[PDB]
Every structure is written in C-alpha cells, then in structure tokens.
Amino acid sequence: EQIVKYARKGLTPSQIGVLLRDAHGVTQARVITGNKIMRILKSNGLAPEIPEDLYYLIKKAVSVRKHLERNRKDKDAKFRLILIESRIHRLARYYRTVAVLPPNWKYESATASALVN
Amino acid sequence: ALAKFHKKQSLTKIEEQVGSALVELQNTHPDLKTSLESIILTQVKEFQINKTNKKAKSAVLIYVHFQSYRVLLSAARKLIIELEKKLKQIVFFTAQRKIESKWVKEHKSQQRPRSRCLTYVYDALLDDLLLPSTLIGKRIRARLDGTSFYRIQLDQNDRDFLEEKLDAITHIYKTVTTREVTFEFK
Amino acid sequence: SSVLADALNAINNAEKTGKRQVLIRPSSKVIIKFLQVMQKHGYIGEFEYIDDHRSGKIVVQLNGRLNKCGVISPRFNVKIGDIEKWTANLLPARQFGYVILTTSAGIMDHEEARRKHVSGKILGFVY
RNA sequence: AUAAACUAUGCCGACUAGGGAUCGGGUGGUGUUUUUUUAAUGACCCACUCGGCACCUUACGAGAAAUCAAAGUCUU
C-alpha cells in the first residue's frame, strides 16, 4: 500500500526524504536507491488506477451497505451510508475538478457497483 | 583547486585557500578521501566577528552544493575539525539553497514547493551551523516594541564544539537572515 | 470565516480588558497591513513574531490607549462626497479621526490616501 | 409527523472566567495493591499536567429588566 507505503517508518525510516532530504536524519541508508530499492517492492506490487483516498472511502462505503441491503432496519446505518456517501462524493469533485477523468469515477458506478479489479 | 567548485571561474583569496585546503585533506587523510572525492563547493563567504574588545576574530562559511549535501553530513564532524586546524578560522557548512518568490510566479504550470520558501530556507542554516549536533528546543519571543528573539535550545553533551562557534553563528545569521539568535544550554 | 473583525476584534476585544495584547488570526497581508497603519500612526505596540502553517508572521504587543476597538466595517465605497461622509464613523472631526480606507492604490488611512487624491474601499477605521 | 417537537435566548467566525464540578492524554508521584521465594507490572489512590467532558460561578460586557461569562459585544 501507499497509505502504508510508510510501514517502512516502522523498520527502515524515516518519513521520508530520502525522497528529497531536508530536516534529514542519522542512520545507514543508501540514498534514493535505498528508498526506491525496496520502496518499489512495497505493496508486493504497484498501483495508480485511482485513487486510494477514495479507493478506500468507496470500499468501506461499499461493503458499508451490504448490511444496509440486508438488515434494512438499522436506519442508524442509513444515517451513515448517507455520510460515508456524501463523503465518497465530496472527494470526487477535487478530481472531477482534477485527477479523475471528467464524469465517471468522478461519478463512477457510485451507487453503485463494487469495483473493480 | 578550481576543480572543487561549480562556477569554476575565479576564486577569492578565501575561496582559493579553501580549495587547496580541501584537496589537501583527501591526499593527507585516507578516510576523507571517499567523502571529499564527492564534495563540491558552490561559493564561500567570510565574516568578521567584531566584538567590543577591538579584537578581530573571523570565521568562514562554505556553501556545499546540494548534490553533495548527503556526503557533507556524512563526515561533517571530522571535516570541520581539520579545516579549522588547517585554516585557523571558524568553519561552517551550509547547503546551497535557492529561494522561490512569493508573488512573482511566472510558470503557469509550476507550483512553488515549500522546500524552497524563505521560512524554510532561512530556518535551514540554523540546523546547518550547529551542524554536528541538532537543537532540542526552538522558540520565539516578541519584545514589546516588536523584536523577535530566537532563544534556541542546544544539547548539553555538545557544549564543546558548539560553545565556541556560538557567537559566529549568531553573527552570520544576523547577516544572512536578519534574526537575533541567542542560545541556551539545557 | 472573516479574518478582519476576526482579529481587530481581539485587539478591540482586548484593550477593553486592558493588557499586553495576544495572538490573532493567521497573518494576512491585510491583517499585518492594518496592524501596520495602526502602529505607524501610533495606537498599537509592535506587530509580532510567529510562523506556522498560515499561523505565521505575528502575535502583537498592545501598549497605549488604542481606545476603543479597531474598526472592522463590512461594505466598501469611497472618494469626495464619500470618504468625508463615512468620516462620520469617526469619533469626532477635530483631529482624532482615522479611517484606514482601502484606496485603489494602497491599504491606506483616512488621510494617508486622502493623500494623492485617492479612494476606493473602506477596510476600516481606528480610535 | 400532531406535539405541554423549549435554556421562552441562533449561529459559518468567539472572548469578559474563573472557581469548582465530571471523561481523555502526560507528569509526577507519593498512597495503596497486584506480580506474586522481593517487585517491576497491573490495579486502587495520590497529586500534576496538559485533552477536550459537561456543567455549574460572576472581581467583566450586556439589555429595555429578571438574567447573561451571552442576548457581553462597533455616542443605542
């Protein structure tokens, strides 16, 4: 992961430049290739499809309605599937205004389609 | 050497001594060979520490190109020791930072990364000077009128290296930055 | 939600308690600027020394009367028949007055842009 | 979906404050007590911090008064 690109901070360091170097540090490290080295490995893989800060909101928010779909009485569940929602949308815009196409994703099968890999 | 410089045009009496001085240490000491091989210079500035004692006590600050900033920090300790012995002057290493403008943006498709802003650049030097050891506490004070004093907290175990440069630093900062910088050991 | 009376209504909101001033908004070229024209005409002490996210630039010691409240105002007109008239905001003609207008050119003062015959917006008004 | 749908008191933006009152963290701890041939730890307590808890309070500001740390709040 990339959110968890920095579970390195755990056993490597140091948040994290290395990717630049400012208020740097004091320990081994073999520079940008020390970073990239296994920093590229990381998620046993890579990514970019789009777009983490949503590829999570939409998820928690996706399963987040399975219950809603079956329970259907936990109105104190809709009261949030509305919110996790208004959120999952509120993101879009700053991408519907930038990073994600100009309709879909920025609109996506949102409400709904468990996406996508 | 014009070798260990980036502009490579002409040096100043100070810059010259520094050049051969550096080339000296990598030939003399086998350990600084590896690190100094790497080190390049940008420019060097000399400053006079004028105290009321009518005593002339000068020191010089050297700008290491950013490329070699990693390396510079790698052996920073030993380097400064030898440079002071070999130049009988106080030595300080900084990174060659380029500051970006606030309102003078001109490249529509270019954002000014915080990494090169005046707050962050000028705040850099302080770390650079006390170099060998980084500070513990940093603070600001507002004298009534409107002064801003930066009493900075320095580690005790470093009283050695830092106690002496202490006055130079203050004075270099007041020159580059514009900030009064008193220190306090804790 | 409005950096103006935000902080001028902290100086204002302060000297009425009486003290040695405090923190404020975040900085603002404008905040700092009024928190200039003030000092430059007197009133306040010494704009101060903070630097954070946008928390940067200043606090700002109090000093002196400065009574009472910096003026915040929330419209904007000016010049001739104007300025003189909104000089009724003032705490009295016979000097005293100061109306920190916004002047096409320069964030200026009731007179400081009465200056070269200037005008525009009405930013505020001091003592 | 009416309401004997209420601090008869708005707030996107906050102070005159305190004192105390409660629930976080961080301290000291000194107090206990666990652990358990001794502890440390854990708990209990203690203070002390800072988190923010809500409240309560007026050496302040109000408004047209009872009240208000707001409705305090920019010749009213």
Short mmCIF file of C-alpha atoms (C1' of nucleotides) in Angstrom, two decimals:
data_model
loop_
_atom_site.label_atom_id
_atom_site.label_comp_id
_atom_site.label_asym_id
_atom_site.label_seq_id
_atom_site.Cartn_x
_atom_site.Cartn_y
_atom_site.Cartn_z
CA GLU A 1 0.00 0.00 0.00
CA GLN A 2 0.85 3.71 -0.17
CA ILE A 3 -1.06 4.87 2.79
CA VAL A 4 1.05 2.06 4.16
CA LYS A 5 3.94 2.73 1.79
CA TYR A 6 5.23 4.01 5.19
CA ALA A 7 5.01 0.91 7.30
CA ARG A 8 8.66 1.40 6.39
CA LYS A 9 8.77 4.09 9.08
CA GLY A 10 8.39 1.03 11.28
CA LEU A 11 11.61 -0.73 10.25
CA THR A 12 13.59 1.45 7.83
CA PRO A 13 12.63 5.15 8.17
CA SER A 14 12.05 7.96 8.29
CA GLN A 15 9.21 9.82 6.65
CA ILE A 16 10.77 10.17 4.22
CA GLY A 17 13.36 12.03 2.20
CA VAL A 18 15.44 10.22 1.19
CA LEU A 19 12.73 11.29 -1.33
CA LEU A 20 14.28 14.78 -1.10
CA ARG A 21 16.26 15.33 2.14
CA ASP A 22 15.56 18.42 4.28
CA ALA A 23 15.45 18.08 8.02
CA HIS A 24 17.26 14.78 7.26
CA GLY A 25 18.50 12.12 9.66
CA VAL A 26 21.30 9.92 11.00
CA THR A 27 21.45 6.25 10.00
CA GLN A 28 22.73 3.97 7.23
CA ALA A 29 20.56 4.45 4.14
CA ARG A 30 21.92 4.15 0.60
CA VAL A 31 20.07 7.17 -0.83
CA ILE A 32 17.34 7.33 -3.49
CA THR A 33 18.11 3.75 -4.46
CA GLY A 34 17.79 2.77 -0.82
CA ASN A 35 14.37 4.27 -0.94
CA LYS A 36 13.29 3.02 -4.38
CA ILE A 37 15.31 -0.12 -3.54
CA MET A 38 12.54 -1.96 -1.69
CA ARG A 39 10.28 1.07 -1.57
CA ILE A 40 9.36 -0.02 -5.12
CA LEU A 41 8.74 -3.57 -3.89
CA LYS A 42 6.45 -2.30 -1.12
CA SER A 43 2.89 -3.42 -1.93
CA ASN A 44 4.23 -6.69 -3.38
CA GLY A 45 3.26 -4.64 -6.36
CA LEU A 46 2.38 -1.11 -7.52
CA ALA A 47 -0.74 0.93 -8.42
CA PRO A 48 -2.17 4.19 -9.78
CA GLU A 49 -5.56 3.13 -11.27
CA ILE A 50 -7.28 5.56 -8.88
CA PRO A 51 -7.35 6.66 -6.28
CA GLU A 52 -6.54 5.49 -2.73
CA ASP A 53 -8.09 8.42 -0.80
CA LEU A 54 -11.30 7.11 -2.45
CA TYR A 55 -10.34 3.52 -3.32
CA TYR A 56 -10.92 3.25 0.40
CA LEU A 57 -13.86 5.62 1.02
CA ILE A 58 -15.74 3.78 -1.71
CA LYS A 59 -14.78 0.46 -0.19
CA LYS A 60 -15.57 0.81 3.47
CA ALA A 61 -18.53 2.61 1.94
CA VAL A 62 -19.25 -0.27 -0.39
CA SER A 63 -19.35 -3.18 1.93
CA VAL A 64 -20.75 -0.48 4.21
CA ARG A 65 -24.16 -1.10 2.69
CA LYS A 66 -24.21 -4.86 2.47
CA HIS A 67 -25.69 -4.77 5.95
CA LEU A 68 -27.90 -1.88 4.83
CA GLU A 69 -29.04 -4.08 1.98
CA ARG A 70 -29.95 -6.99 4.17
CA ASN A 71 -30.53 -5.53 7.65
CA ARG A 72 -32.61 -2.65 6.25
CA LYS A 73 -33.85 -1.79 9.72
CA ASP A 74 -30.61 -0.32 11.09
CA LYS A 75 -31.77 3.08 9.98
CA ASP A 76 -28.94 4.11 12.26
CA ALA A 77 -26.99 2.63 9.38
CA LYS A 78 -28.53 4.56 6.57
CA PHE A 79 -27.80 7.69 8.64
CA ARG A 80 -24.15 6.92 7.87
CA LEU A 81 -24.30 5.26 4.43
CA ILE A 82 -25.52 8.74 3.60
CA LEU A 83 -22.46 10.27 5.20
CA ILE A 84 -19.74 7.83 4.11
CA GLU A 85 -21.51 8.57 0.91
CA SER A 86 -21.76 12.34 0.78
CA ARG A 87 -18.11 11.87 1.52
CA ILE A 88 -17.28 9.36 -1.22
CA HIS A 89 -18.78 12.01 -3.48
CA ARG A 90 -17.25 15.09 -1.81
CA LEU A 91 -13.88 13.65 -2.82
CA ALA A 92 -14.68 13.07 -6.47
CA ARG A 93 -15.11 16.84 -7.17
CA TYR A 94 -11.46 17.75 -6.38
CA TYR A 95 -10.74 15.37 -9.26
CA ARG A 96 -13.92 15.77 -11.21
CA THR A 97 -12.03 19.02 -10.99
CA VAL A 98 -8.56 17.46 -11.45
CA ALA A 99 -7.27 13.89 -11.25
CA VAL A 100 -10.08 11.52 -12.28
CA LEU A 101 -11.46 11.83 -15.84
CA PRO A 102 -14.42 14.18 -16.22
CA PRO A 103 -17.51 12.14 -15.45
CA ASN A 104 -17.16 8.51 -14.44
CA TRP A 105 -15.02 7.70 -11.39
CA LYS A 106 -15.65 11.38 -10.69
CA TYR A 107 -19.14 9.91 -10.92
CA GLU A 108 -18.33 6.22 -11.27
CA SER A 109 -20.79 3.39 -10.90
CA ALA A 110 -21.04 5.07 -7.49
CA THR A 111 -24.35 3.94 -6.08
CA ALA A 112 -23.47 1.50 -7.12
CA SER A 113 -21.00 -1.14 -8.24
CA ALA A 114 -18.42 -2.96 -6.12
CA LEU A 115 -15.29 -2.06 -8.11
CA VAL A 116 -13.24 -3.09 -9.84
CA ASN A 117 -10.12 -5.22 -10.18
CA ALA B 1 41.53 23.73 -7.00
CA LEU B 2 39.05 25.21 -9.49
CA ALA B 3 38.23 21.53 -9.59
CA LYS B 4 36.30 21.50 -6.32
CA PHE B 5 33.92 24.32 -7.39
CA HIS B 6 30.93 24.65 -9.72
CA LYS B 7 31.30 28.09 -11.32
CA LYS B 8 34.99 27.28 -11.91
CA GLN B 9 35.77 30.86 -12.97
CA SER B 10 37.96 32.59 -10.38
CA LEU B 11 38.15 32.16 -6.59
CA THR B 12 38.69 34.67 -3.79
CA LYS B 13 41.77 34.50 -1.57
CA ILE B 14 39.41 32.81 0.91
CA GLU B 15 37.78 30.54 -1.66
CA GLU B 16 41.23 29.59 -3.03
CA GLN B 17 42.67 28.52 0.33
CA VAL B 18 39.53 26.50 0.89
CA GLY B 19 40.00 24.75 -2.45
CA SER B 20 43.59 23.62 -1.97
CA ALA B 21 42.77 23.06 1.71
CA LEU B 22 40.15 20.52 0.72
CA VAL B 23 42.28 18.89 -1.95
CA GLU B 24 44.91 18.72 0.81
CA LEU B 25 42.85 16.65 3.25
CA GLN B 26 41.87 13.93 0.74
CA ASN B 27 45.56 13.41 -0.08
CA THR B 28 46.71 13.62 3.53
CA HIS B 29 43.98 11.59 5.26
CA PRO B 30 42.80 8.31 3.64
CA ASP B 31 39.39 8.36 5.36
CA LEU B 32 38.17 11.71 4.00
CA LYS B 33 39.28 10.57 0.56
CA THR B 34 36.00 8.81 -0.24
CA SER B 35 33.77 11.62 1.08
CA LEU B 36 35.84 14.54 -0.18
CA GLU B 37 36.13 12.89 -3.56
CA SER B 38 32.41 13.63 -3.75
CA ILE B 39 32.24 17.09 -2.16
CA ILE B 40 31.89 20.07 -4.50
CA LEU B 41 31.68 23.72 -3.49
CA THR B 42 29.27 26.44 -4.60
CA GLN B 43 30.69 29.52 -3.01
CA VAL B 44 32.37 30.58 0.25
CA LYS B 45 31.73 33.67 2.39
CA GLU B 46 33.93 35.20 5.05
CA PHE B 47 32.51 37.11 8.01
CA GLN B 48 34.19 39.22 10.70
CA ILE B 49 33.11 38.70 14.30
CA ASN B 50 33.57 42.18 15.71
CA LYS B 51 33.28 42.29 19.49
CA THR B 52 33.66 45.44 21.65
CA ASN B 53 37.12 44.09 22.61
CA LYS B 54 38.53 45.72 19.44
CA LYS B 55 39.54 42.12 18.66
CA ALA B 56 39.33 40.86 15.09
CA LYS B 57 38.14 37.23 15.16
CA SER B 58 36.96 35.96 11.78
CA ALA B 59 35.44 32.76 10.52
CA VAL B 60 34.22 31.47 7.16
CA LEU B 61 31.07 29.72 5.99
CA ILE B 62 31.21 27.42 2.99
CA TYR B 63 28.35 26.55 0.62
CA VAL B 64 28.41 22.86 -0.33
CA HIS B 65 26.43 22.09 -3.48
CA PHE B 66 23.20 20.32 -2.73
CA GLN B 67 24.28 17.24 -4.65
CA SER B 68 26.99 16.61 -2.06
CA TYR B 69 24.87 17.61 0.90
CA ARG B 70 24.35 13.97 1.85
CA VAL B 71 28.08 13.30 1.88
CA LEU B 72 28.87 16.60 3.61
CA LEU B 73 26.79 15.49 6.54
CA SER B 74 28.28 12.01 6.43
CA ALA B 75 31.71 13.20 7.65
CA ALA B 76 30.79 16.73 8.71
CA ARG B 77 32.45 16.35 12.12
CA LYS B 78 35.95 15.38 11.09
CA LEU B 79 35.88 17.69 8.08
CA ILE B 80 35.34 20.85 10.07
CA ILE B 81 37.97 19.81 12.63
CA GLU B 82 40.72 19.59 10.01
CA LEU B 83 39.57 22.68 8.14
CA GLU B 84 39.83 24.78 11.28
CA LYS B 85 43.26 23.35 12.10
CA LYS B 86 44.38 23.98 8.50
CA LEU B 87 42.93 27.49 8.18
CA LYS B 88 42.99 28.80 11.73
CA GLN B 89 39.48 30.19 11.21
CA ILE B 90 35.99 29.12 12.26
CA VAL B 91 34.27 26.86 9.71
CA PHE B 92 30.57 26.40 8.85
CA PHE B 93 28.99 24.33 6.08
CA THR B 94 25.58 25.09 4.52
CA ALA B 95 23.61 23.79 1.60
CA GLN B 96 23.25 25.97 -1.47
CA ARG B 97 19.52 26.66 -1.20
CA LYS B 98 17.63 28.57 -3.86
CA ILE B 99 14.63 30.57 -2.66
CA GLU B 100 11.48 30.88 -4.76
CA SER B 101 9.39 34.07 -4.99
CA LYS B 102 6.04 34.61 -3.33
CA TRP B 103 4.10 36.70 -5.80
CA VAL B 104 6.49 36.54 -8.74
CA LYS B 105 5.21 33.23 -10.06
CA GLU B 106 5.62 33.08 -13.84
CA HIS B 107 5.37 29.41 -14.92
CA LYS B 108 1.58 28.84 -15.02
CA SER B 109 2.14 25.11 -14.77
CA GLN B 110 4.60 25.37 -11.87
CA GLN B 111 3.89 25.28 -8.15
CA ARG B 112 6.38 26.64 -5.64
CA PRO B 113 7.36 23.65 -3.47
CA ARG B 114 7.55 24.60 0.19
CA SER B 115 11.02 23.03 0.28
CA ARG B 116 12.45 26.25 -1.17
CA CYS B 117 10.49 29.01 0.65
CA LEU B 118 12.01 31.77 2.76
CA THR B 119 10.73 30.49 6.09
CA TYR B 120 12.13 27.02 5.42
CA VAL B 121 15.35 28.11 3.77
CA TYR B 122 16.41 30.62 6.38
CA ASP B 123 15.36 28.16 9.06
CA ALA B 124 17.71 25.72 7.41
CA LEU B 125 21.00 27.45 8.19
CA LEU B 126 20.50 27.17 11.89
CA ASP B 127 20.42 23.40 11.65
CA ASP B 128 23.44 23.58 9.32
CA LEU B 129 25.62 25.73 11.57
CA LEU B 130 25.28 23.95 14.88
CA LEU B 131 25.67 21.05 12.42
CA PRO B 132 27.42 18.21 14.32
CA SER B 133 24.50 18.36 16.78
CA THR B 134 20.92 19.41 16.09
CA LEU B 135 18.95 21.52 18.55
CA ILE B 136 16.42 20.26 21.09
CA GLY B 137 14.16 23.28 21.51
CA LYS B 138 13.46 26.29 19.33
CA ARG B 139 11.49 29.34 20.46
CA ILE B 140 10.34 32.84 19.55
CA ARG B 141 9.78 35.85 21.79
CA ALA B 142 8.09 39.17 20.99
CA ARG B 143 9.69 42.04 22.81
CA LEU B 144 7.09 44.75 23.37
CA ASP B 145 8.07 47.10 20.56
CA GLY B 146 8.21 44.26 18.02
CA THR B 147 11.50 42.40 18.06
CA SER B 148 11.61 38.63 17.66
CA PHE B 149 14.28 36.78 19.65
CA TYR B 150 15.10 33.15 18.86
CA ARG B 151 16.39 31.55 22.01
CA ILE B 152 17.43 28.11 20.82
CA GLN B 153 17.91 25.03 22.97
CA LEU B 154 21.20 23.26 22.49
CA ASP B 155 22.17 19.85 23.79
CA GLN B 156 24.49 19.71 26.80
CA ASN B 157 26.79 16.89 25.61
CA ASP B 158 27.81 19.17 22.72
CA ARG B 159 28.87 22.19 24.81
CA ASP B 160 32.33 21.61 23.33
CA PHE B 161 32.06 22.18 19.60
CA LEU B 162 29.08 24.50 19.88
CA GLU B 163 30.10 26.85 22.69
CA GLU B 164 32.84 28.44 20.60
CA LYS B 165 31.12 28.87 17.24
CA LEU B 166 28.18 30.20 19.27
CA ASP B 167 28.99 33.89 18.59
CA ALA B 168 29.95 33.41 14.98
CA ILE B 169 26.67 31.70 14.23
CA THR B 170 24.69 34.48 15.86
CA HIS B 171 26.57 36.96 13.75
CA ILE B 172 26.33 35.07 10.47
CA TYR B 173 22.60 34.60 10.93
CA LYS B 174 22.02 38.30 11.67
CA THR B 175 23.78 38.90 8.39
CA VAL B 176 22.09 36.38 6.13
CA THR B 177 18.72 36.05 7.77
CA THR B 178 18.08 39.09 9.98
CA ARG B 179 17.29 37.17 13.10
CA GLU B 180 18.75 37.78 16.58
CA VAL B 181 19.65 34.31 17.80
CA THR B 182 20.53 33.73 21.44
CA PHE B 183 21.26 30.23 22.59
CA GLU B 184 20.64 28.44 25.87
CA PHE B 185 22.10 25.13 27.01
CA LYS B 186 19.82 22.59 28.66
CA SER C 1 -14.83 32.90 8.44
CA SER C 2 -13.64 36.59 8.10
CA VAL C 3 -10.03 37.45 9.08
CA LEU C 4 -10.83 41.14 9.64
CA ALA C 5 -13.01 41.83 12.67
CA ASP C 6 -11.74 38.38 13.40
CA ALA C 7 -8.51 39.85 14.86
CA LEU C 8 -9.16 43.57 15.01
CA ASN C 9 -11.96 42.34 17.29
CA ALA C 10 -9.37 40.78 19.55
CA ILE C 11 -7.22 43.84 19.89
CA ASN C 12 -10.51 45.67 20.18
CA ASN C 13 -11.62 42.71 22.21
CA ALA C 14 -8.59 43.08 24.41
CA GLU C 15 -7.55 46.61 25.26
CA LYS C 16 -11.02 46.84 26.76
CA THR C 17 -9.94 44.23 29.28
CA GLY C 18 -6.60 46.04 29.33
CA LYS C 19 -3.33 44.18 28.84
CA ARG C 20 -0.27 43.31 26.72
CA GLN C 21 -2.01 42.05 23.58
CA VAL C 22 -2.15 38.46 22.35
CA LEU C 23 -2.23 36.16 19.34
CA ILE C 24 -4.75 36.59 16.41
CA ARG C 25 -5.85 35.19 13.01
CA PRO C 26 -3.09 33.73 10.87
CA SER C 27 -1.23 36.71 9.32
CA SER C 28 -2.82 38.08 6.18
CA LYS C 29 -1.04 40.65 4.12
CA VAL C 30 -4.03 42.73 5.13
CA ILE C 31 -4.07 41.81 8.88
CA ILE C 32 -0.41 42.69 9.05
CA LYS C 33 -1.05 45.78 6.99
CA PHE C 34 -3.69 47.30 9.21
CA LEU C 35 -1.68 46.04 12.18
CA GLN C 36 0.73 48.35 10.44
CA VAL C 37 -1.11 51.58 9.68
CA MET C 38 -2.11 51.29 13.31
CA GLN C 39 1.43 51.25 14.73
CA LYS C 40 2.60 53.80 12.13
CA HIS C 41 0.05 56.30 13.43
CA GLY C 42 0.53 55.05 16.97
CA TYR C 43 -2.06 53.19 18.99
CA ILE C 44 -0.60 49.65 18.93
CA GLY C 45 2.83 48.40 20.03
CA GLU C 46 4.98 46.11 17.94
CA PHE C 47 3.46 43.65 15.46
CA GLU C 48 4.96 40.26 16.36
CA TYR C 49 6.85 37.09 15.58
CA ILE C 50 5.05 33.86 14.75
CA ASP C 51 5.48 31.45 11.79
CA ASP C 52 3.42 28.30 11.19
CA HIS C 53 1.08 26.75 8.66
CA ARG C 54 -0.53 30.10 7.82
CA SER C 55 -0.25 30.91 11.55
CA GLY C 56 2.92 32.69 10.58
CA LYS C 57 4.30 36.20 10.84
CA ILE C 58 2.94 37.62 14.11
CA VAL C 59 1.44 37.97 17.56
CA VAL C 60 1.45 41.69 18.56
CA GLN C 61 2.03 43.55 21.89
CA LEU C 62 -0.59 46.10 22.95
CA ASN C 63 0.53 49.33 24.65
CA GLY C 64 -1.15 52.73 24.83
CA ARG C 65 -4.78 53.76 24.71
CA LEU C 66 -5.95 52.49 21.32
CA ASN C 67 -9.47 53.04 22.69
CA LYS C 68 -11.52 51.65 21.59
CA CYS C 69 -11.61 48.78 19.16
CA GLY C 70 -10.03 48.81 15.74
CA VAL C 71 -12.94 49.26 13.25
CA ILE C 72 -13.90 46.27 11.12
CA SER C 73 -16.54 47.52 8.67
CA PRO C 74 -18.18 45.19 6.00
CA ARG C 75 -19.09 47.23 2.86
CA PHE C 76 -16.81 49.36 0.57
CA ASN C 77 -17.20 52.74 -1.19
CA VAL C 78 -15.12 55.98 -1.28
CA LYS C 79 -13.93 59.41 -2.52
CA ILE C 80 -15.16 63.02 -2.41
CA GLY C 81 -18.79 63.10 -1.30
CA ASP C 82 -17.90 59.71 0.13
CA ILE C 83 -14.81 59.39 2.39
CA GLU C 84 -15.70 62.71 4.07
CA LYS C 85 -19.17 61.33 4.80
CA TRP C 86 -18.12 57.92 6.16
CA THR C 87 -15.80 60.14 8.22
CA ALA C 88 -18.92 60.34 10.35
CA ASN C 89 -17.87 56.88 11.52
CA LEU C 90 -15.15 58.87 13.23
CA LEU C 91 -15.01 59.57 16.99
CA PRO C 92 -15.04 63.33 16.15
CA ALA C 93 -13.82 65.73 13.46
CA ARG C 94 -11.33 67.90 15.32
CA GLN C 95 -8.43 65.59 14.51
CA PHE C 96 -8.77 62.34 16.44
CA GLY C 97 -10.21 60.54 13.42
CA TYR C 98 -8.52 57.90 11.30
CA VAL C 99 -10.42 55.74 8.80
CA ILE C 100 -7.95 53.16 7.46
CA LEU C 101 -9.60 53.11 3.94
CA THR C 102 -8.50 50.66 1.24
CA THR C 103 -7.62 53.13 -1.64
CA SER C 104 -7.39 51.84 -5.18
CA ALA C 105 -3.69 52.27 -4.60
CA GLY C 106 -2.52 51.26 -1.12
CA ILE C 107 -4.17 49.97 2.05
CA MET C 108 -4.19 53.48 3.44
CA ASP C 109 -5.61 55.72 6.17
CA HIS C 110 -8.43 58.33 6.26
CA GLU C 111 -5.76 60.86 5.32
CA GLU C 112 -2.88 58.63 4.23
CA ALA C 113 -4.76 58.24 0.98
CA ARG C 114 -6.69 61.45 1.31
CA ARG C 115 -3.08 61.85 0.18
CA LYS C 116 -2.58 61.93 -3.50
CA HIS C 117 -6.38 62.30 -4.12
CA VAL C 118 -7.15 58.55 -3.66
CA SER C 119 -10.18 56.38 -2.93
CA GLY C 120 -11.95 53.02 -3.22
CA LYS C 121 -12.79 50.50 -0.50
CA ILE C 122 -13.41 51.23 3.20
CA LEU C 123 -11.37 48.48 5.03
CA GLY C 124 -11.81 50.08 8.49
CA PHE C 125 -11.26 52.95 10.99
CA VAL C 126 -9.03 53.40 14.11
CA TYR C 127 -9.65 55.10 17.53
"C1'" A D 1 -45.24 13.58 11.97
"C1'" U D 2 -49.67 16.24 15.75
"C1'" A D 3 -46.88 17.55 19.79
"C1'" A D 4 -47.48 20.95 27.28
"C1'" A D 5 -41.34 18.88 18.98
"C1'" C D 6 -38.23 24.95 24.51
"C1'" U D 7 -32.19 27.10 28.35
"C1'" A D 8 -39.15 31.34 26.43
"C1'" U D 9 -32.05 33.15 24.36
"C1'" G D 10 -29.26 31.23 16.77
"C1'" C D 11 -25.28 30.96 14.62
"C1'" C D 12 -20.25 29.99 9.15
"C1'" G D 13 -16.42 33.00 12.90
"C1'" A D 14 -15.53 33.61 19.96
"C1'" C D 15 -13.73 36.30 24.31
"C1'" U D 16 -15.05 39.12 29.57
"C1'" A D 17 -13.62 33.21 33.78
"C1'" G D 18 -12.89 31.76 36.65
"C1'" G D 19 -13.86 28.63 40.69
"C1'" G D 20 -15.50 24.02 41.17
"C1'" A D 21 -17.79 20.07 39.46
"C1'" U D 22 -17.32 15.29 35.68
"C1'" C D 23 -14.32 11.98 30.83
"C1'" G D 24 -9.45 11.67 27.93
"C1'" G D 25 -3.66 12.05 27.29
"C1'" G D 26 1.11 13.32 30.09
"C1'" U D 27 3.63 14.05 34.56
"C1'" G D 28 4.74 13.32 38.97
"C1'" G D 29 4.06 10.54 42.14
"C1'" U D 30 3.88 9.95 46.85
"C1'" G D 31 -0.84 6.38 48.70
"C1'" U D 32 -2.39 1.77 48.34
"C1'" U D 33 -2.32 -3.31 45.57
"C1'" U D 34 -1.05 -6.75 42.35
"C1'" U D 35 3.02 -9.82 40.45
"C1'" U D 36 3.26 -12.83 43.37
"C1'" U D 37 10.85 -17.00 47.01
"C1'" U D 38 11.02 -9.49 46.83
"C1'" A D 39 8.92 -6.24 42.62
"C1'" A D 40 8.78 -4.25 38.16
"C1'" U D 41 3.95 -4.67 36.08
"C1'" G D 42 -1.22 -4.40 36.89
"C1'" A D 43 -4.91 -2.27 39.63
"C1'" C D 44 -6.53 1.11 43.51
"C1'" C D 45 -5.34 6.01 45.30
"C1'" C D 46 -2.47 10.42 45.30
"C1'" A D 47 -1.09 14.95 43.17
"C1'" C D 48 0.24 17.44 38.37
"C1'" U D 49 -0.27 18.15 33.73
"C1'" C D 50 -1.86 19.07 29.53
"C1'" G D 51 -7.23 16.56 26.03
"C1'" G D 52 -11.18 18.28 25.25
"C1'" C D 53 -16.45 16.35 29.34
"C1'" A D 54 -20.22 18.95 30.61
"C1'" C D 55 -21.91 21.66 33.94
"C1'" C D 56 -22.27 24.89 37.20
"C1'" U D 57 -19.93 30.55 39.01
"C1'" U D 58 -19.53 36.17 38.09
"C1'" A D 59 -13.75 40.78 40.88
"C1'" C D 60 -16.36 41.61 33.20
"C1'" G D 61 -19.76 43.18 28.63
"C1'" A D 62 -24.66 43.42 28.07
"C1'" G D 63 -30.15 44.78 27.73
"C1'" A D 64 -35.23 47.91 27.64
"C1'" A D 65 -35.10 44.30 33.19
"C1'" A D 66 -35.20 39.16 35.59
"C1'" U D 67 -30.57 37.16 33.82
"C1'" C D 68 -26.26 36.62 30.80
"C1'" A D 69 -19.41 34.60 31.03
"C1'" A D 70 -24.21 35.56 26.49
"C1'" A D 71 -28.65 38.37 24.44
"C1'" G D 72 -21.27 40.67 26.56
"C1'" U D 73 -20.38 42.73 22.22
"C1'" C D 74 -18.92 48.58 16.75
"C1'" U D 75 -22.33 58.11 21.05
"C1'" U D 76 -28.21 52.80 21.35
#
